Every structure is written in structure tokens, then in C-alpha cells.
Design an enzyme around this catalytic site. Sequence first.
Site, PDB file in Angstrom:
ATOM      1  N   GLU A   1       2.208 -13.142  44.503  1.00  0.00           N
ATOM      2  CA  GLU A   1       2.687 -13.078  43.144  1.00  0.00           C
ATOM      3  C   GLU A   1       2.675 -14.676  42.490  1.00  0.00           C
TER       4      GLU A   1
ATOM      5  N   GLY B   1     -35.979  -7.649  73.382  1.00  0.00           N
ATOM      6  CA  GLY B   1     -36.939  -7.366  72.544  1.00  0.00           C
ATOM      7  C   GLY B   1     -37.732  -8.640  72.289  1.00  0.00           C
TER       8      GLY B   1
ATOM      9  N   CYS C   1     -18.883 -10.353  66.852  1.00  0.00           N
ATOM     10  CA  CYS C   1     -17.896  -9.905  66.276  1.00  0.00           C
ATOM     11  C   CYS C   1     -16.683  -8.944  67.285  1.00  0.00           C
TER      12      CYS C   1
ATOM     13  N   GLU D   1      -9.124 -22.253  65.529  1.00  0.00           N
ATOM     14  CA  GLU D   1      -8.581 -20.937  65.783  1.00  0.00           C
ATOM     15  C   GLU D   1      -8.251 -20.874  66.940  1.00  0.00           C
TER      16      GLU D   1
ATOM     17  N   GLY E   1     -15.859 -12.319  69.101  1.00  0.00           N
ATOM     18  CA  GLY E   1     -15.668 -13.053  67.822  1.00  0.00           C
ATOM     19  C   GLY E   1     -14.464 -12.442  67.243  1.00  0.00           C
ATOM     20  N   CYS E   2     -14.735 -12.139  65.736  1.00  0.00           N
ATOM     21  CA  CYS E   2     -13.317 -11.437  64.987  1.00  0.00           C
ATOM     22  C   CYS E   2     -12.293 -10.683  65.574  1.00  0.00           C
TER      23      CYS E   2
ATOM     24  N   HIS F   1       7.022  -8.339  43.006  1.00  0.00           N
ATOM     25  CA  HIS F   1       8.348  -9.237  43.725  1.00  0.00           C
ATOM     26  C   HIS F   1       8.911  -8.408  44.658  1.00  0.00           C
TER      27      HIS F   1
ATOM     28  N   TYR G   1     -13.943 -23.729  62.358  1.00  0.00           N
ATOM     29  CA  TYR G   1     -12.762 -22.906  62.243  1.00  0.00           C
ATOM     30  C   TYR G   1     -12.663 -22.339  63.767  1.00  0.00           C
TER      31      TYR G   1
ATOM     32  N   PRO H   1     -11.509 -10.077  69.086  1.00  0.00           N
ATOM     33  CA  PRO H   1     -10.558 -10.348  70.163  1.00  0.00           C
ATOM     34  C   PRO H   1      -9.761 -11.624  69.596  1.00  0.00           C
ATOM     35  N   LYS H   2     -10.563 -12.610  68.906  1.00  0.00           N
ATOM     36  CA  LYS H   2      -9.789 -13.665  68.175  1.00  0.00           C
ATOM     37  C   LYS H   2      -8.414 -13.540  67.342  1.00  0.00           C
TER      38      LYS H   2
HETATM   39  C1  LIG Z   1      18.441  -2.072  45.144  1.00  0.00           C
HETATM   40  C2  LIG Z   1      17.311  -2.372  44.352  1.00  0.00           C
HETATM   41  C3  LIG Z   1      16.360  -2.987  44.792  1.00  0.00           C
HETATM   42  C4  LIG Z   1      15.485  -3.713  43.795  1.00  0.00           C
HETATM   43  N1  LIG Z   1      14.083  -4.140  44.339  1.00  0.00           N
HETATM   44  C5  LIG Z   1      13.141  -4.576  43.460  1.00  0.00           C
HETATM   45  C6  LIG Z   1      12.034  -5.159  44.053  1.00  0.00           C
HETATM   46  O1  LIG Z   1      11.816  -4.988  45.333  1.00  0.00           O
HETATM   47  N2  LIG Z   1      11.337  -5.777  43.158  1.00  0.00           N
HETATM   48  C7  LIG Z   1      11.406  -5.674  41.539  1.00  0.00           C
HETATM   49  O2  LIG Z   1      10.531  -6.154  40.792  1.00  0.00           O
HETATM   50  N3  LIG Z   1      12.511  -5.325  41.147  1.00  0.00           N
HETATM   51  C8  LIG Z   1      13.247  -4.560  42.002  1.00  0.00           C
HETATM   52  N4  LIG Z   1      14.586  -4.144  41.587  1.00  0.00           N
HETATM   53  C9  LIG Z   1      14.951  -4.185  40.210  1.00  0.00           C
HETATM   54  C10 LIG Z   1      15.346  -5.517  39.568  1.00  0.00           C
HETATM   55  O3  LIG Z   1      16.625  -5.976  40.353  1.00  0.00           O
HETATM   56  C11 LIG Z   1      15.803  -5.327  38.229  1.00  0.00           C
HETATM   57  O4  LIG Z   1      14.635  -4.901  37.397  1.00  0.00           O
HETATM   58  C12 LIG Z   1      16.120  -6.703  37.410  1.00  0.00           C
HETATM   59  O5  LIG Z   1      17.291  -7.244  38.107  1.00  0.00           O
HETATM   60  C13 LIG Z   1      16.143  -6.682  35.819  1.00  0.00           C
HETATM   61  O6  LIG Z   1      16.826  -7.759  35.526  1.00  0.00           O
HETATM   62  P1  LIG Z   1      17.669  -7.732  34.360  1.00  0.00           P
HETATM   63  O7  LIG Z   1      17.705  -9.299  33.820  1.00  0.00           O
HETATM   64  O8  LIG Z   1      17.216  -6.753  33.331  1.00  0.00           O
HETATM   65  O9  LIG Z   1      19.254  -7.577  34.447  1.00  0.00           O
HETATM   66  P2  LIG Z   1      20.215  -7.764  35.989  1.00  0.00           P
HETATM   67  O10 LIG Z   1      19.209  -8.733  37.048  1.00  0.00           O
HETATM   68  O11 LIG Z   1      20.876  -6.547  36.100  1.00  0.00           O
HETATM   69  O12 LIG Z   1      21.340  -8.982  35.207  1.00  0.00           O
HETATM   70  C14 LIG Z   1      22.183  -8.507  34.449  1.00  0.00           C
HETATM   71  C15 LIG Z   1      23.456  -9.507  34.141  1.00  0.00           C
HETATM   72  O13 LIG Z   1      24.361  -9.352  33.290  1.00  0.00           O
HETATM   73  C16 LIG Z   1      25.572  -9.167  33.511  1.00  0.00           C
HETATM   74  N5  LIG Z   1      26.318  -8.612  32.691  1.00  0.00           N
HETATM   75  C17 LIG Z   1      26.299  -7.102  32.035  1.00  0.00           C
HETATM   76  N6  LIG Z   1      27.257  -6.949  31.116  1.00  0.00           N
HETATM   77  C18 LIG Z   1      27.623  -8.246  30.671  1.00  0.00           C
HETATM   78  C19 LIG Z   1      28.528  -8.690  29.678  1.00  0.00           C
HETATM   79  N7  LIG Z   1      29.094  -7.717  28.901  1.00  0.00           N
HETATM   80  N8  LIG Z   1      28.712 -10.140  29.532  1.00  0.00           N
HETATM   81  C20 LIG Z   1      28.192 -10.828  30.464  1.00  0.00           C
HETATM   82  N9  LIG Z   1      27.251 -10.598  31.543  1.00  0.00           N
HETATM   83  C21 LIG Z   1      27.224  -9.215  31.586  1.00  0.00           C
HETATM   84  C22 LIG Z   1      25.246  -8.270  34.944  1.00  0.00           C
HETATM   85  O14 LIG Z   1      26.597  -8.360  35.604  1.00  0.00           O
HETATM   86  C23 LIG Z   1      24.319  -8.900  35.644  1.00  0.00           C
HETATM   87  O15 LIG Z   1      24.796 -10.185  36.369  1.00  0.00           O
HETATM   88  C24 LIG Z   1      15.672  -3.670  42.553  1.00  0.00           C
HETATM   89  C25 LIG Z   1      16.835  -3.010  41.953  1.00  0.00           C
HETATM   90  C26 LIG Z   1      17.837  -2.505  42.918  1.00  0.00           C
HETATM   91  C27 LIG Z   1      19.097  -2.001  42.513  1.00  0.00           C
HETATM   92  C1  LIG Z   2     -15.249 -16.972  67.650  1.00  0.00           C
HETATM   93  C2  LIG Z   2     -15.926 -16.314  66.334  1.00  0.00           C
HETATM   94  C3  LIG Z   2     -15.049 -15.668  65.676  1.00  0.00           C
HETATM   95  C4  LIG Z   2     -15.677 -15.158  64.401  1.00  0.00           C
HETATM   96  N1  LIG Z   2     -14.702 -14.777  63.616  1.00  0.00           N
HETATM   97  C5  LIG Z   2     -15.154 -13.891  62.466  1.00  0.00           C
HETATM   98  C6  LIG Z   2     -14.236 -13.373  61.688  1.00  0.00           C
HETATM   99  O1  LIG Z   2     -12.744 -13.323  61.728  1.00  0.00           O
HETATM  100  N2  LIG Z   2     -14.686 -12.814  60.399  1.00  0.00           N
HETATM  101  C7  LIG Z   2     -16.018 -12.545  60.064  1.00  0.00           C
HETATM  102  O2  LIG Z   2     -16.295 -12.351  59.045  1.00  0.00           O
HETATM  103  N3  LIG Z   2     -16.964 -13.302  61.085  1.00  0.00           N
HETATM  104  C8  LIG Z   2     -16.334 -13.742  62.232  1.00  0.00           C
HETATM  105  N4  LIG Z   2     -17.309 -14.526  63.058  1.00  0.00           N
HETATM  106  C9  LIG Z   2     -18.746 -14.361  62.757  1.00  0.00           C
HETATM  107  C10 LIG Z   2     -19.395 -12.858  62.942  1.00  0.00           C
HETATM  108  O3  LIG Z   2     -19.044 -12.815  64.445  1.00  0.00           O
HETATM  109  C11 LIG Z   2     -21.013 -13.125  62.851  1.00  0.00           C
HETATM  110  O4  LIG Z   2     -21.113 -13.445  61.551  1.00  0.00           O
HETATM  111  C12 LIG Z   2     -21.538 -11.533  63.043  1.00  0.00           C
HETATM  112  O5  LIG Z   2     -21.396 -11.333  64.522  1.00  0.00           O
HETATM  113  C13 LIG Z   2     -23.120 -11.763  62.906  1.00  0.00           C
HETATM  114  O6  LIG Z   2     -23.632 -10.558  63.263  1.00  0.00           O
HETATM  115  P1  LIG Z   2     -25.281 -10.426  63.332  1.00  0.00           P
HETATM  116  O7  LIG Z   2     -25.494  -8.958  63.324  1.00  0.00           O
HETATM  117  O8  LIG Z   2     -25.856 -11.375  62.520  1.00  0.00           O
HETATM  118  O9  LIG Z   2     -25.367 -10.726  65.051  1.00  0.00           O
HETATM  119  P2  LIG Z   2     -24.651 -10.746  66.248  1.00  0.00           P
HETATM  120  O10 LIG Z   2     -23.248  -9.985  65.946  1.00  0.00           O
HETATM  121  O11 LIG Z   2     -24.632 -11.879  67.080  1.00  0.00           O
HETATM  122  O12 LIG Z   2     -25.516  -9.542  67.130  1.00  0.00           O
HETATM  123  C14 LIG Z   2     -26.772 -10.024  67.611  1.00  0.00           C
HETATM  124  C15 LIG Z   2     -27.121  -9.065  68.862  1.00  0.00           C
HETATM  125  O13 LIG Z   2     -28.375  -9.323  69.214  1.00  0.00           O
HETATM  126  C16 LIG Z   2     -28.348  -9.497  70.471  1.00  0.00           C
HETATM  127  N5  LIG Z   2     -29.831 -10.006  70.870  1.00  0.00           N
HETATM  128  C17 LIG Z   2     -30.139 -11.419  70.795  1.00  0.00           C
HETATM  129  N6  LIG Z   2     -31.516 -11.579  71.139  1.00  0.00           N
HETATM  130  C18 LIG Z   2     -31.824 -10.259  71.563  1.00  0.00           C
HETATM  131  C19 LIG Z   2     -33.055  -9.832  71.959  1.00  0.00           C
HETATM  132  N7  LIG Z   2     -34.158 -10.647  71.900  1.00  0.00           N
HETATM  133  N8  LIG Z   2     -33.016  -8.369  72.056  1.00  0.00           N
HETATM  134  C20 LIG Z   2     -32.311  -7.571  72.025  1.00  0.00           C
HETATM  135  N9  LIG Z   2     -31.035  -7.968  71.395  1.00  0.00           N
HETATM  136  C21 LIG Z   2     -30.922  -9.276  71.377  1.00  0.00           C
HETATM  137  C22 LIG Z   2     -27.260 -10.360  71.014  1.00  0.00           C
HETATM  138  O14 LIG Z   2     -27.005 -10.609  72.157  1.00  0.00           O
HETATM  139  C23 LIG Z   2     -26.112  -9.751  70.000  1.00  0.00           C
HETATM  140  O15 LIG Z   2     -25.632  -8.708  70.773  1.00  0.00           O
HETATM  141  C24 LIG Z   2     -16.731 -15.078  64.185  1.00  0.00           C
HETATM  142  C25 LIG Z   2     -17.752 -15.685  65.053  1.00  0.00           C
HETATM  143  C26 LIG Z   2     -17.482 -16.470  66.310  1.00  0.00           C
HETATM  144  C27 LIG Z   2     -18.222 -16.961  67.283  1.00  0.00           C
END
Ligand SMILES: Cc1cc2nc3c(=O)[nH]c(=O)nc-3n(C[C@H](O)[C@H](O)[C@H](O)COP(=O)(O)OP(=O)(O)OC[C@H]3O[C@@H](n4cnc5c(N)ncnc54)[C@H](O)[C@@H]3O)c2cc1C
Ligand SMILES: Cc1cc2nc3c(=O)[nH]c(=O)nc-3n(C[C@H](O)[C@H](O)[C@H](O)COP(=O)(O)OP(=O)(O)OC[C@H]3O[C@@H](n4cnc5c(N)ncnc54)[C@H](O)[C@@H]3O)c2cc1C
Lengths: 586, 586
Positions: B569, B223, B149, B295, B153-154, B564, B291, B156-157
Site C-alpha cells: 500500500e 540432438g 529452473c 542469492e 535454478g528457480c 491496510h 543475482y 531449488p533456489k
Molecule cells: C476488529 C477490526 C479490525 C479491522 N481491520 C481492518 C483492516 O485490517 N483494514 C482496514 O482497512 N480497516 C480495518 N478495520 C476498520 C477500520 O478500523 C475503520 O474503518 C477505521 O478505524 C475508521 O476510522 P474513522 O476515522 O472513521 O473512525 P475511528 O477510527 O473509529 O475513530 C473515531 C474516534 O473518535 C472518537 N469519538 C467518538 N465520539 C466522539 C466524541 N463525541 N468526541 C470525541 N471523540 C469521539 C472515538 O472514540 C474514536 O477514537 C477494522 C475494524 C475493526 C473493528
Molecule cells: C541459479 C539460477 C536461478 C534462477 N532463478 C530464476 C528465478 O527465480 N526466476 C526466473 O524466472 N528464472 C530464473 N532462472 C533462469 C531460468 O532458469 C532460465 O531462464 C530458464 O531455465 C530458461 O529455460 P530454457 O528453456 O531457455 O533452457 P533450460 O531450462 O536451460 O533447458 C535447456 C535444456 O536443454 C538441454 N540440452 C542442451 N543441449 C542439448 C542438446 N544438444 N540436446 C538435448 N538437450 C540439450 C539442457 O541440458 C537443458 O535440460 C535461474 C537460473 C539459474 C541458473
Amino acid sequence: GTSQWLRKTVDSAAVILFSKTTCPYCKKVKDVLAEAKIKHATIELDQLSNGSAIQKCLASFSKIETVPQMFVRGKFIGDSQTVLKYYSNDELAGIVNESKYDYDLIVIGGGSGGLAAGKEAAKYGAKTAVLDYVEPTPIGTTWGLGGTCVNVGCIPKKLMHQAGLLSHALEDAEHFGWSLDRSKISHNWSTMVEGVQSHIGSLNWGYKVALRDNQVTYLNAKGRLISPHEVQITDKNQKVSTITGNKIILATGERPKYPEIPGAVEYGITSDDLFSLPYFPGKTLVIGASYVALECAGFLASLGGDVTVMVRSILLRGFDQQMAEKVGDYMENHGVKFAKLCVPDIKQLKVVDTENNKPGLLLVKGHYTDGKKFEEEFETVIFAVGREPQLSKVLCETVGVKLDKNGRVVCTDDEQTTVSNVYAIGDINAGKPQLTPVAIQAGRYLARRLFAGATELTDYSNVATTVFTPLEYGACGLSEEDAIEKYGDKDIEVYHSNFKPLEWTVAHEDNVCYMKLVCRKSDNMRVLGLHVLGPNAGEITQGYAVAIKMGATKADFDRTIGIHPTCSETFTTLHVTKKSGVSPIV
Amino acid sequence: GTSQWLRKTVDSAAVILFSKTTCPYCKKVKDVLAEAKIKHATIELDQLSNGSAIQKCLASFSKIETVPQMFVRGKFIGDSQTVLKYYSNDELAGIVNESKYDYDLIVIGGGSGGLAAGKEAAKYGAKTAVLDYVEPTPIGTTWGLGGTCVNVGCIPKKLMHQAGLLSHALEDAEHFGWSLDRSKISHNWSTMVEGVQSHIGSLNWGYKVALRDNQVTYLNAKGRLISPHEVQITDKNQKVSTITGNKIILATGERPKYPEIPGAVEYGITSDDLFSLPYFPGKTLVIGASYVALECAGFLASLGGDVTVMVRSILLRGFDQQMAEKVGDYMENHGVKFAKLCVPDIKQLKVVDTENNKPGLLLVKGHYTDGKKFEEEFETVIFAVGREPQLSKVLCETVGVKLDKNGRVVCTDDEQTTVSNVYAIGDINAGKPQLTPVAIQAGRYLARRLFAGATELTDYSNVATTVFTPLEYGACGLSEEDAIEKYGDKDIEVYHSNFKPLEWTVAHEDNVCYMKLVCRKSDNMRVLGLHVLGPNAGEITQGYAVAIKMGATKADFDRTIGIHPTCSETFTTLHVTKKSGVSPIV
Ligand SMILES: Cc1cc2nc3c(=O)[nH]c(=O)nc-3n(C[C@H](O)[C@H](O)[C@H](O)COP(=O)(O)OP(=O)(O)OC[C@H]3O[C@@H](n4cnc5c(N)ncnc54)[C@H](O)[C@@H]3O)c2cc1C
Ligand SMILES: Cc1cc2nc3c(=O)[nH]c(=O)nc-3n(C[C@H](O)[C@H](O)[C@H](O)COP(=O)(O)OP(=O)(O)OC[C@H]3O[C@@H](n4cnc5c(N)ncnc54)[C@H](O)[C@@H]3O)c2cc1C
Ligand SMILES: CCOc1ccc(CC(=O)O)cc1
Ligand SMILES: CCOc1ccc(CC(=O)O)cc1
């Protein structure tokens, strides 16, 4: 309890059919309804434990105990023979359209919650209207259907966060072998804004199409509830009229607050204006310390802005304060200046240039707690000092809907207000997390209880969050300080570790990303809160929220195997406790 | 059962202390051991339900029932008075070092599993040696401590995957407003390789430092187990000697296979050579469909290579085949060519230029199942046709260790071989998932059972995976076809949806990312398999593996609220079933 549920279901459903899956008489009614395009709810009694008991309770309304039974707006309409009689005589459409009110449901507010509730209600035959109006900001900004998240919230803010992240992608690409020189590349604000706004425009249009495709009436008008069942509407031409509805959903959201200081409303802006601003803000002051304040300050700095944040007291009040300080330290080390323990007392030096699309110029005067004066020039000043509803513009106080001291609506656990046909969802529901997926779940689940006989309530506990600052912060459950207050320091164990994303190695910080699990000793090491500072923190956090909802323990995290190489796998091997004093660094 | 556990624990622990947390006589012994720097395990009987019973069973070895009791290599050493007697007379160090063998533990193999087992064993006083040797590839490539790895393995890849992802980051940055032109930027392979190899070098060195800091003897030697307790070692100078150990852990891993065709070993390369290659591969043919094959083909194409993959039959045999086809379709639409239903029959046209660091040139001849001939020139040919152990080079057959038909070691559920002091972990353990975090968990948990009296076994079920192709594929649990084979088509329900990352909107595909939940109807809609194709798929998948380990149902996913805006989600709102025939597109 069965009898109480059936009575509530029959009274509130618009069009509902009681049925069994294996009955050919029910099939014949379904086919008639399908042909005539009559949407309705269906309850299959042969898939319910108490279905036999429901079949007997139905006779309190219909005087029969067989299926099918069809109901419209609380009235028994007929069995299979009777429904086909109405159809054969061209009488059925008129019966299913008969109502004391114009609509089965009127939604006031076309945002996250209101659009989700209206679309779902219409699926079960509820005749629905959605009202939406966007009162312009002080400088005149307005936008289309979809609410705060779509137009001036989660959607544009995460897209500009992505533009900021790509600045560091450009830097990283040099170390990974790409031939560019980041120091010769610049950013064009208005090109970014045009692309963001074109996506927002596709969402405005998609919601209008979705409402028309669901037979929902969309009115671009301001709504006001003047009695339990009457809504007064004012349109774009200022024509005033009245419509009536059986159920009412208040879903009107909030808007930004301004501080009560000279020049604030005249010369500053808020997040409402930022996401469509026709000019680059330039040298910017953000007044405030909320997640909105820090998210906006963060991407403006990554896009090349000279940014200062003015902090009255602490960052991210209400969030875990260890994590909030780590969020802020990362920003200060990566180009954001902080004016700490400072408040503002705004003068105009230059008017915004709407012809060459350039900012104006402002003088900000303020003061620090140590007595020093603050006086500095900025091209743009953004207020992020909280949000509030304005329900007196929406809700006549004689209707009888109870509000709390912050002006939000006081509801039972099924979103019902003190007026029994009126419900409130989203940001205006007092005490609930103010998030878009919460509003959507509340609205869809409520529509099903109202019009399809469902019972499932929305669960507002342990809802996961992510703050999209330059280094992101995801969380689910209690902060460490809240857990210790609730259960005592002796009953709390905290496991933690720093980590380093593999992506950061070749790109050249070691011990800055951080995670912790806050657990309860006396309850099998139950995980009470999960916290992570690192890239893609929302993708990391989301899946763990399911496990926390099911009552995950530290042992459950230990027995689960990690995926390698990822940031998230560090949660599967945590072992250092805070009590032990051993360093969490790698 | 208590008596059986105590006997096994005393027999195998190197240095172990039975204690109670509240006893001052135990504290006095701990302080003597701490001062003399004697590492040991400790079992606090006042924190165990059956601790009183253990205290009585201890008298079968010591003839006393009080704490503390100290044991060395299966022998009772003394109570508090006796231990301090040995210390006062400068006799203690010699007693705790007395053994029939050179080492308490010899680990053959310094990779993921072997390094994790050796470090953990040394913590409890086990005198440990780690043996590691890297047999060179046919062209002569070799590398340092850390295993597959870390070196080939994991690690550098995924770093070269990140370099490939940054090509699409550069393209995206134009749409988000940055002033670069991607079509004028090129990639420098050798600059990338130097940075990757400098990180790998820091890991080689960090492992050597970690072994020295834990008092583990590191021998860079091959070994060979010649009897249950004797290991013959051959060093760099070809000196042959013998060392003895009480417990043996085989952790030697696998190496790539080559096809038995002319020119394959002489002119092709494998993943072992790719990650340190001094020249850019250029126009490349990848033979294989694992895989690893996909990859490597994927990042070479994103770095500007002309890449072809030659597929004998299907992609990713053993993975969900719907998901495997979606992985392959994305690659074919994004610059990877596929020679389908084709096998190779390799001629050299140009030798590798080791002075100007340029590839050679090869002619590949093969044939398709329809009879057509394959004949095409390539600068580099990479074989990814599987991996295998070579235990006959490690394990003399007279020792008595059982192998299966694939040459892997047959173990009980506690990793024990048919020779009771010999254990096998990692890729050579027959039937286990071949992943780095599995090897690490197995090795650390085994060390604790051997030397600290632990009982916890490694859980090999529902281990989550991620394939790091250009569009990533994460999974946990059963494929859809395996679930249907096991339980019947009528007992399986599949919920699914397409989605689009928000990041992809402004960057300009709609319905390509995809996720599904495979569930069991008769078991409360238990989630049997989770599958996601999209960006950051390993971060998405990891947290859900905890919930699946706890037996999550569809209802648990439904009641959890989304974060959100994120890709993850979408799992919280799934509703379209495959049985219904409704399209999953947005
Ligand atoms: C800058 C900012 C970033 C945010 N980022 C996130 C985020 O990343 N994730 C998240 O989950 N939440 C986020 N929120 C919160 C999210 O926007 C609010 O929780 C969500 O919009 C609430 O929805 P609501 O239906 O209660 O009201 P609103 O979405 O405010 O809708 C109410 C609507 O009714 C209208 N209205 C009001 N009075 C009247 C009326 N008398 N007659 C007719 N229409 C009317 C309004 O003009 C508006 O269009 C963020 C809020 C802000 C301000
Ligand atoms: C290209 C590639 C990508 C991978 N990507 C992922 C990934 O994204 N995520 C993931 O979870 N797994 C990944 N894997 C799998 C992961 O690398 C292996 O599951 C993990 O390395 C297993 O570890 P190990 O301890 O069983 O053996 P190894 O990590 O192979 O270690 C065994 C060591 O013992 C040495 N050895 C062998 N015989 C002897 C001996 N007689 N005396 C002394 N030393 C000896 C070997 O040379 C080696 O250094 C990938 C594998 C490859 C090939
Ligand atoms: C405009 C409505 O005003 C209300 C104020 C308070 C209540 C408190 C209660 O429900 O007991 C109810 C209604
Ligand atoms: C070199 C060892 O060869 C073995 C082959 C098979 C077994 C099968 C069994 O354990 O019954 C055991 C040992």
C-alpha cells in the site's frame, strides 16, 4: 466554472497566496511568510491552463489583476507592498490570526480519518483542533489516541494474525531441516499482548507528537455539535465549555453491537476488549460471522485455543459466497469448530480472576433451526455481531444534519452534510466502504479542497480489501453473483484456477488455494472482479487494483509476463472458464 | 494482409479445420474427428471480422468457398462429404498421418521453453518429439527432465531461500510469545536437500507423464541439427541415428562459466552442483556478484554458514545501482562478509569425504586493487561468474543459423532464425530477458502461430523481475540511471519512501525497506520504472506490472486506494521527490 471555483476557494481558505513561479515580487512575499513562520497555501497560476482567466477573476475581490495577491479568511489582504507594510509595522501576525471563530477547523474524532484531515489542514495555515475521547467498554476498557484501527482494529489484529501464522512456520521449519519439535512448544498469550500493546503505545505517543509538531491543538474531551459553528466539550474532570470553528469535520466512527439477550453485556466481551485482555481467553465461543468474527476465531485457534464459531445463517454476508465458503472450509479443516444455523438465548459459572490472570467460566444456551438445544461451557464469549455509530451523543438534532435509517450521515460526493460548513468522513459516512485507507484519503483530500483550493474528489469505487483469516482472502471489484445480477449470466465469463505455493511443497494441501477473474464479454472482456485465496493475499491483490482502476481487460492480464516463482503469477496465465466445465485443479 | 496470413497458416498447420460455430456440417466433421481421436486446430470464421474475406481466400487452395474445409500439412483434404468418405473406408487415419518427415515438430531441449512449446503444439495435431540430455558437470552431477529452473535454478533456489527465511521466523516467534529459544536450534543441510530433491523428482516424473498424456515422443538423447530438417541423435548407449522434422525449435539453454585460473574446474563448484550437494558446504567463498551469487550467499549464511562474497567491481551489474547497494548493505549487516575490489588467482588441502558426507578444504589465493594479497582457507568455493550457451555442440555451422558475438541466436520478433523452419526460444534467443516465464510465453505463443493460425507475438518489454536475496528486491521497467540517460535529468521525477513492515515492529529495522517510482514529466508523469526492497517483493511487484503494461501514470497510483495493513500500500501514497531533498525516512 472558473469563477465559481475561485469564489469557493477564497471564501474557505485560511491563508492563501496567488503567485507565479518566476516572479520576484512573489518570492519576496514568500520569504517574509517563511521568516515569520506563517503557514499558507500557494497557487502558482503559471502552471494552470486557465491561469490567465483566474488572474482576471481575482479582481472581483481585490480590484487588481497582478500577482502576488494574499487572502486571509475570505478577505483580500494586499499585494507585495502592502504585505511588507504590515510586516514592517509588526501588524502582520495580528492580521493572519484575526477570525470570527476560535478555530478554522474543529475535528470531532481522533481516528484514522480525523487525524489525517487535521494534520493536512494545518499544513495550509488552518488553525485546527482535534477532539478525541474513548468511551469505556462495559467492563471498563479504554485506550489512547489513534482510533479503532490503531488501538482495537487493523493493527493489533494483524499482529496477532502474525503470531498465529508463526505456529505454522514452526511446523514448516522441521520439514525444511531445522531441529525443533513443534509439539513441545507452547504460546504465552500475555507475552504477546505486552509486545502488541507496547507498539500501540508508541503509536499513541507518535500521534500526540505529530499534532504538536503541526501546531494542532489536541483536546482529550468529548465533543458535541450544538449549532453549526459551536462545539460543547466535556473534559476528564467533567468541566463543560464551548469552542467555535469555521469548518467542522465529524469523524467519530462506530462501536461494537451486543445482542439483546440476558447476560450478554455483563459476561461477554467484544473486539474492543480482546486486544488488551490480561488473560488468555481459553476455550472460546465467537458469536457472529463477519470478517472480524472469523479473523479473531482464526488466530485464537492457531495460538492453541479450543474455538467454536456460532453462525446464524451464512459467512461473510456481502462478500462473494463461493470465496466465503472456501475461507470457512479451510478453517474447519484446521482446528475451528462451527455451530451452524444456531443462535444464542449467557449464565456465569466463574468470575474472571484478576489476580492470577485467568478467565472465568460461562454457560451458553441457544438453539438450532432444527429444534435441537445448544448448551455448552466456555471460558470466554466474544460477540462480533456488527458495529454502529451513536451520533445522538455527538450531534444535536436541531443542528440540521441528515442521517439515514442506520444512523449514518448523508453526504454529497465531496463529503458535505446538509449543513454546509459541516462534513463527515470515515465509517459514519453513509454508503462508503468502511476501511482505514478510505478514511485517510477522504480526510486528506477534503482538507486540500477546503484550505488549498484543490478539486480532486475521493474515488470510492473498486476499493480492494483483504480478510486476514488463517488462509487470507483478497478481492477487488464485484463478486461473481453481483456481476451476474447486474449484467446477465450470458454476458459474464469467469476464468479460474487452483494453485499451490512453492513453500507448501516441502512442507507437505494441493488444490486449496484458488483465484478467479470475473469478466464482461460485451466490454472487451473487462475485468469486473478479482478474487484470490492464498498466503500474503493483500500483497498479491494491491497492485492489480491500479490496473482495475484503469479498466484492465483479460487481454491486459494475458500480455503481462509473470514473476517466477510466486503465487501472484498465476493471474497472468489463466485459461479455464467456468462455462466450459473443465476442472480448475492442477 | 488477409491473403498473406491464410497462406502462411495453411502451409504450416499440421491438421486444421475451417468452420463456423452454427453449421451442422461442421459439427458432423468435428464428431468424426473426436471419435477417431484426431487432434486438430479449428478456426471459427463467424467470430472474425474478416471472416467473410477468409472464406473467399480459401478458394485459392480448395476451389470452394464453403465451410467446413479440412487441411493436412498444406494440402486441402475435403469438405464434409469427402472427410466422411475417408472415414467410412478406413482411409482417414492414413491421410492425417502422411508426412514427408518423421515429425511436424522436433524440440531440441527439454527445459522451461521447450516443454511448453512441445505440449502446446501437440494439442493441435502436430506430431512432436522433445529431445533432452543433461551433460554432467565436471564432478559428475546430472539430473532429470525439466531444465535449469526445475532442477538447478528457480525451484531449488527459492526453496532454500525459504529455509533461510525460516531462521528469522524462529527468531521472530520468541517476540510474538512462542516458548522456543532460537539459539539452541540448528539446521541439518542434508535433511533439507532430501526434501528439495524429492519435490524436484516429482516434477521430473510429472513432465514425463505430461508428455506421454499429450502423445509427445520423449527421447533422452543429445540432438544435433545437421541440416534444416535433419537431427542426429546420440542415445545413452552412444547409438547414433537420424530423425527428420518439418519445424525445429532450438531451446537448449546455457550452463555456468568458470574463470581460467588453476584449480577452478578441479576443486570449485557451481550452482549446478550446489542444489544436490550431499554435504553441507561449511565455510564458503562465493566468487561473483550476479543475482545467482548473492542469492546463494544469502541463504547459506541464514542456514548458519560462514560466508564470504568476492566482488571484482560492482554488485548486480545491469540493475539499478542504488537498489543493488541497498541489497548488499542488508546482507553485510546480516552475516555476509564481502571481499571488495578483489579477484582470484585454488589449491587443494583436503579431498571431499564421500563416506561421512563432509566437505574438503581449499586454499584460495587472490589480490586486491590496492596491491594487498588475498589468502584464506575455505571448505567450499562456488563460482557464479556468468552463464553461456554452447551451440557448436548443437548446431552444425553449415546449416546457416546466424549467431551473435556471445554465441546466442539472432531472431526476428517471431523467434524465426535465418533458416526459415528453425526457431529459437528461451535463454539462447539473443537480446531477450533470460527468465522462465518469458521462455514459457514464447514457446506457447510460437506453437499457436505455427500450428493454429494465431498471430499474437510475445511482448518482451517491461518484464518484471525479483532477486530473492535475504531482503528481496522486485523491479519492473527502467532503472533510474537508464531513465535519466534516455530522457535527460530534467524530464525525470522520482518519488520515494522508506517503510517498515508491521511484522517487524514487535520483532524489533526502521528505515531499511525502500521503494521508488521513476517517472517522465513530459508524458503525464508516466511510470517508467518501479522498484521495491522488502519482504515478499515478488508478490508486491507482480500486479503493478499489468498497470505498467497499460501505461500507468503517477495519477493512476494516487487515485487507487491502499489495502491496510500491507507493505504494498505504500505505493498508493508516495509524495516525497528526490529533487526536493526531503528525507524519505519515516
Ligand atoms: C476488529 C477490526 C479490525 C479491522 N481491520 C481492518 C483492516 O485490517 N483494514 C482496514 O482497512 N480497516 C480495518 N478495520 C476498520 C477500520 O478500523 C475503520 O474503518 C477505521 O478505524 C475508521 O476510522 P474513522 O476515522 O472513521 O473512525 P475511528 O477510527 O473509529 O475513530 C473515531 C474516534 O473518535 C472518537 N469519538 C467518538 N465520539 C466522539 C466524541 N463525541 N468526541 C470525541 N471523540 C469521539 C472515538 O472514540 C474514536 O477514537 C477494522 C475494524 C475493526 C473493528
Ligand atoms: C541459479 C539460477 C536461478 C534462477 N532463478 C530464476 C528465478 O527465480 N526466476 C526466473 O524466472 N528464472 C530464473 N532462472 C533462469 C531460468 O532458469 C532460465 O531462464 C530458464 O531455465 C530458461 O529455460 P530454457 O528453456 O531457455 O533452457 P533450460 O531450462 O536451460 O533447458 C535447456 C535444456 O536443454 C538441454 N540440452 C542442451 N543441449 C542439448 C542438446 N544438444 N540436446 C538435448 N538437450 C540439450 C539442457 O541440458 C537443458 O535440460 C535461474 C537460473 C539459474 C541458473
Ligand atoms: C436533523 C436533520 O434532519 C434532516 C432530515 C432529512 C433531511 C432531508 C433533506 O435534506 O431533504 C434533511 C435534514
Ligand atoms: C552459420 C550462419 O552464418 C550466418 C552469419 C551471418 C548472417 C548474417 C545475415 O543474415 O546477413 C547469416 C548467417
